[PDB]
Design an enzyme around this catalytic site. Structure first.
Site, short mmCIF file in Angstrom:
data_model
loop_
_atom_site.label_atom_id
_atom_site.label_comp_id
_atom_site.label_asym_id
_atom_site.label_seq_id
_atom_site.Cartn_x
_atom_site.Cartn_y
_atom_site.Cartn_z
N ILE A 115 -28.73 30.07 -34.57
CA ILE A 115 -27.94 28.89 -34.93
C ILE A 115 -28.16 28.58 -36.40
CG2 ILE A 115 -28.00 27.93 -32.57
CD1 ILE A 115 -29.93 25.82 -33.40
N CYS A 116 -27.11 28.07 -37.03
CA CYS A 116 -27.21 27.64 -38.42
C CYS A 116 -27.18 26.14 -38.47
CB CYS A 116 -26.03 28.20 -39.21
SG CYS A 116 -26.12 27.83 -40.93
N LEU A 117 -28.30 25.56 -38.89
CA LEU A 117 -28.43 24.11 -39.00
C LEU A 117 -27.98 23.63 -40.39
CD1 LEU A 117 -31.80 23.44 -37.17
CD2 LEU A 117 -29.42 23.43 -36.33
#
Length: 163
Positions: A115-117
């Protein structure tokens, strides 16, 4: 604003203490006790808030984590498998949560389903080292990511609920 928002989200999650990662022997064992104590209190709090939204387990050494998260949208409950490895330089470095089923399905993600926060998360974690652990990564990282990405993917028909 950011300080208060962070406090509101994490105030009843036990804070962690030990600066130790996977190679650190007795100190890693102690860090893992803090991680499990913080995780289980967070789970208990979640049950009390009718938001029991994940389960995690680890391997014997506590270096590989895996489990499930659930997300409710328009009353339908969606389940996703999640996994992550603990970086050698944990807890200074945050683990990268993968949701492998969603690999390639949203732009807010790297290859492999990591996931890219948003950029705010990294300095927030950095400013709090070693106080934040896996419970905080779930509360402040995965949780808000799902609350944006899952509705989007449902709306786009990328995620469909199984009957």
């Amino acid at each position: 604003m950011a300080d208060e928002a962070t406090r509101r989200v994490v105030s009843e999650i036990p804070v962690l203490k030990t600066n130790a990662g996977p190679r650190d022997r007795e100190l890693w064992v102690q860090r893992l006790k803090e991680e499990y104590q913080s995780l289980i209190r967070y789970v208990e709090n979640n049950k009390n808030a009718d938001n029991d939204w994940f389960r995690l387990e680890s391997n014997k050494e506590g270096t590989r984590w895996f489990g499930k998260c659930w997300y409710i949208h328009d009353l339908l409950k969606y389940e996703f498998d999640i996994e992550f490895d603990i970086p050698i330089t944990y807890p200074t470095t945050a683990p990268e949560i993968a949701v492998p089923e969603l690999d390639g399905k949203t732009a807010k993600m790297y290859r492999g389903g990591k996931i890219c926060l948003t950029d705010h998360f990294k300095p927030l974690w950095a400013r709090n080292v070693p106080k934040f652990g896996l419970a905080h990564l779930m509360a402040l990282g995965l949780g808000p990511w799902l609350a944006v990405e899952i509705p989007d993917l449902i709306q786009k028909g990328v995620i469909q609920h199984k009957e």
